[PDB]
Amino acid sequence: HMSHIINAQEDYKHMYLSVQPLDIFCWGTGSMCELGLGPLAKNKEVKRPRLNPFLPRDEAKIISFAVGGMHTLALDEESNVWSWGCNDVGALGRDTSLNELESTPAKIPRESFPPLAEGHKVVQLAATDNMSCALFSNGEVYAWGTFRCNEGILGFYQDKIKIQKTPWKVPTFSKYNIVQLAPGKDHILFLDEEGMVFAWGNGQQNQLGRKVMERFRLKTLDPRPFGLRHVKYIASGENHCFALTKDNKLVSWGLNQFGQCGVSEDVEDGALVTKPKRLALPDNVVIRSIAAGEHHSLILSQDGDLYSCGRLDMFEVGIPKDNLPEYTYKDVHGKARAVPLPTKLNNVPKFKSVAAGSHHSVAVAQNGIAYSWGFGETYAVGLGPFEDDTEVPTRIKNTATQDHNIILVGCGGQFSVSGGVKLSDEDAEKRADEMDDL
C-alpha cells in the first residue's frame, strides 16, 4: 504494498547489524550474571572491557546484541539467538535449571524460533529488564520473559501468561510489518511500516501513551497504538520514550521528573508527560539516533554532535560543572540536579553511536574509540579502579580494546557490552599516533 508505507526494515539495519563478526567485550558489575563471563567470583566485577571468551569471533560469530537491565541477547551469522544474565523470570528464553548456565552465554534452541526453519532471519533483538524480543525479516515478533511494575510482576500477555519461559509468537497487532523495536525497563515499543507506534508492558509512568486504570492493566497487556502516527524512528529510556516523525519532529512522553524528556525548563517531582510533546532542537540538527537511561537522554545528530538532558546527580548528562547552562535546575538547597533541555556537549569528539544504561553511558567516536561517563560505583564506565562518577565523556583505554575499531555498544543496569574488530597494525599505529598528538 500500500501507499501508506514509509518505513522498511532495511532502513534500520546499519544501527543493529554488523557486516563483520565481532570481538565481544563486557565490563561492570555482574552480580546477577549480567557480564556473561562465567561463574567465577572474580568475574562478577570487571573494571575494564574484558574480551568475552564464550563468544569467540571465529566461531560464535556475533554480529548484533541487545543489552537489557539484567540480561543480554546476541545474534550470530546464522541468526541464532544467544542469551546470558538473570533468568529468574524467563528472560534468557532457555533452560538454566554464579549460576553457570546463566552466567555463560549460550544459544537458545533453534527450534524455539519456527521462522528460522522457513528461511527467515532475526533483524533486531531487544531486551528490557525482564523481557526479550526478536524481530524477524517477515515482520513477526517473538517475545519471552515478563513485565514487572513498581511492586512486583505485572505479567507477560493479558491475563493469559504471567511468565513466558520460551520464545513465543506475539499475535499480530498490525496490518503492516513491524520494522523496529525500542525496549524500556518494563515496556517495549514497536514501529510498523506505516509509522504507527505500539506499546506493551507496564504503564504506571504513562510510557504506553495512554492512562491505564488498575483493573484494566492485565485486560490490555498487549501491544496497542495510542494515536501516534507518521513515525520513522523510535527509542526508549526506562520509563520515557522518543519518536521521530517523517517531518523530522522529535516528540517524547512518559517519566519526566528530571527533565529527561527534554520538553520543558520546568522540573517537578512526579512529572509525567502524557501526550507526546515536541523537543526544541536547533533547525540545523538531523537526528541519527537516541539512547536513554532511567533519568537521562542522549540525542545524536547526523553530524556527530551529542545533546543530553536529564539528571546530573551522577553526572548522567556528562556536562562539566563550569559549563552548566543557565536553565540547569537547582533544588531548594541550591544543588544542581538536572539539565532539562537538550544541551550540546562540548570538548568531545564527533560520535557515530551512543548507548545508555540506568545511570551511565557509552558513546563511540567516529574513529572507533569508546567514551564513557556517569555513575561510577559499579564500574560500568570501564575506567578502572575508581568508584567516583565520571563527569564528562572519557576515553576508554585498555590493552584489550586500545587497537580495536568499536562498532556496537550497549548498556544495562550495572554493566556495558561492546563489539569491535581489530585494526590492522598499520591502522592501529596511525590512530594511536593521531590520539597521542592531542
Curated annotation (Swiss-Prot):
Organism field: Saccharomyces cerevisiae (strain ATCC 204508 / S288c)
GO CC annotations on file: chromatin; cytoplasm; nucleus
Function of the molecule: Guanine nucleotide exchange factor that promotes the exchange of GSP1/GSP2-bound GDP by GTP and controls RNA metabolism and transport. Involved in yeast pheromone response pathway and in mRNA metabolism. Involved in nuclear pore complex (NPC) assembly and required for mRNA and ribosome nuclear export. Binds chromatin and is involved NPC-mediated transcriptional control.
Name this polypeptide is given: Guanine nucleotide exchange factor SRM1
Gene3D superfamilies: Regulator of chromosome condensation 1/beta-lactamase-inhibitor protein II (2.130.10.30)
Pfam families: WD40_RLD (PF25390)
UniProt entry tagged with the keyword Electron transport: no
Keywords in alphabetical order: Cell cycle, Cell division, Guanine-nucleotide releasing factor, Mitosis, Nucleus, Pheromone response, Phosphoprotein, Repeat, Transport
An MF annotation (GO) of this entry: guanyl-nucleotide exchange factor activity
